[PDB]
């Protein structure tokens, strides 16, 4: 087994997979274009891998190897030298001693911590994960970015309503041109905003909500999407992207309704045909006052629920996501916290 210990050491220290005899317990595909699938071979395992502890150990080793291979592919280096971190791993000599003692678990935890530290340092200093999360919160969550989406809505007021009232045969080329010119005028430094793409869905927001949840339902057929590249796609999956799309569509519906209400109020308060009265009207306090009270109630409902949401859900989640990456330890843990926050938002 001197060969197997060396193979395991290489896999746990560099992520290099060299199994020409199909003996190692893990091997990846591509020996979807950037994300390869890692298959675990249970016929050549070293333990049972049935209990929760053994399953977590195997998952930790596999995650260490995956992170090592991803760092190698990102740095374009054939191997990761030990000087890149303060953690050194010793090669396995006695397989029986390694199996009977906790030295295996110690080495696995050490290499996993080293890989996680290297990955976090790389994605924090070279990729600017803080800027990435700020940009995605500005795009999908509307965090400190309401001005841009409000300007977009005010510029494409007629286009959106005409597309929602017409069928799918209505040409959205004007809306696409507006979106692309806005993206071009946007600063090229914002990679998320420059890669933001727009599209039309055949189903509505309540339709997709009823398709995804256990609820019952041609308006609001617009949505946005981001194509997460490598090696950022191994962290930003597609489920969080779909959650972001749903939250963005909901916020867009809310903002469009508030914009319609604001436009109605501005018309009612600025039109002389509305603000004019006399000639023994006897209809002013009956019609104009009634509709103004109705609009005031609609405002005190919509704006109030929007404030409640954006304060006790959106703001709280933004604060938690901002305080979570303070001295991080696991990128997978950060992703799990983000998914849990999104799940809380959706299940509120």
């Amino acid at each position: 087994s001197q060969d197997y210990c060396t193979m395991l050491y290489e896999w746990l220290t560099q992520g290099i997979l060299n199994d020409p005899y199909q003996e190692f317990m893990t091997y990846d595909d591509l020996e979807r274009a950037w994300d390869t699938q890692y298959f675990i071979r249970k016929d050549v395992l070293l333990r049972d891998c049935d209990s929760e502890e053994d399953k977590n150990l195997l998952f930790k080793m596999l995650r260490t190897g995956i992170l090592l291979k991803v760092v190698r592919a990102s740095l374009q280096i054939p191997t990761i030298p030990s000087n890149s971190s303060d953690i050194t791993i010793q090669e396995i000599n006695d397989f029986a001693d390694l199996m009977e003692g906790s030295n295996l678990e110690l080495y696995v935890d050490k290499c996993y911590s080293r890989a996680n530290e290297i990955f976090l340092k790389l994605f924090f200093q070279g990729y600017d994960l803080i800027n990435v999360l700020k940009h995605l919160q500005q795009i999908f969550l509307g965090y400190q970015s309401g001005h841009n989406v409000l300007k977009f809505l005010t510029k494409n007021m007629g286009e959106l309503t005409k597309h929602y009232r017409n069928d799918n045969n209505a040409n959205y080329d004007k809306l696409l041109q507006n979106f692309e010119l806005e993206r071009q005028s946007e600063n090229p430094n914002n990679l998320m905003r420059q890669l933001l793409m727009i599209q039309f869905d055949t189903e509505t927001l309540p339709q997709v909500l009823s398709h995804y949840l256990q609820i019952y339902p041609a308006i609001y057929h617009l949505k946005f999407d981001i194509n997460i590249p490598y090696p950022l796609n191994i962290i930003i999956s597609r489920t969080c992207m779909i959650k972001y799309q749903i939250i963005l569509r909901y916020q867009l519906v809310l903002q469009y309704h508030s914009r319609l209400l604001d436009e109605t109020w501005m018309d009612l308060n600025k039109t002389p045909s509305w603000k004019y009265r006399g000639y023994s009207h006897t209809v002013k306090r009956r019609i104009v006052r009634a509709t103004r009270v109705l609009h005031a109630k609609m405002n005190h409902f919509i704006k109030t629920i929007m404030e409640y949401f954006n304060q006790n859900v959106i703001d709280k989640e933004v604060y938690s996501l901002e305080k979570c990456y303070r001295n991080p330890t696991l990128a997978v843990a950060i992703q799990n916290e983000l998914e849990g926050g999104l799940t809380n938002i959706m299940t509120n």
Binding site: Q37, F39, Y212, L213, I242, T347
Partner: peptide
């Protein structure tokens, strides 16, 4: 047990959404 059933409902919603999102769990030969 109220927080427990709330977390259970959240976990059920998460499982439903993960099963709807392409089913990342797979097995090969």
């Amino acid at each position: 047990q109220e927080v427990r059933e709330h977390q259970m409902k959240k976990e059920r919603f998460d499982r439903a959404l993960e099963s709807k999102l392409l089913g990342k769990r797979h097995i090969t030969y």
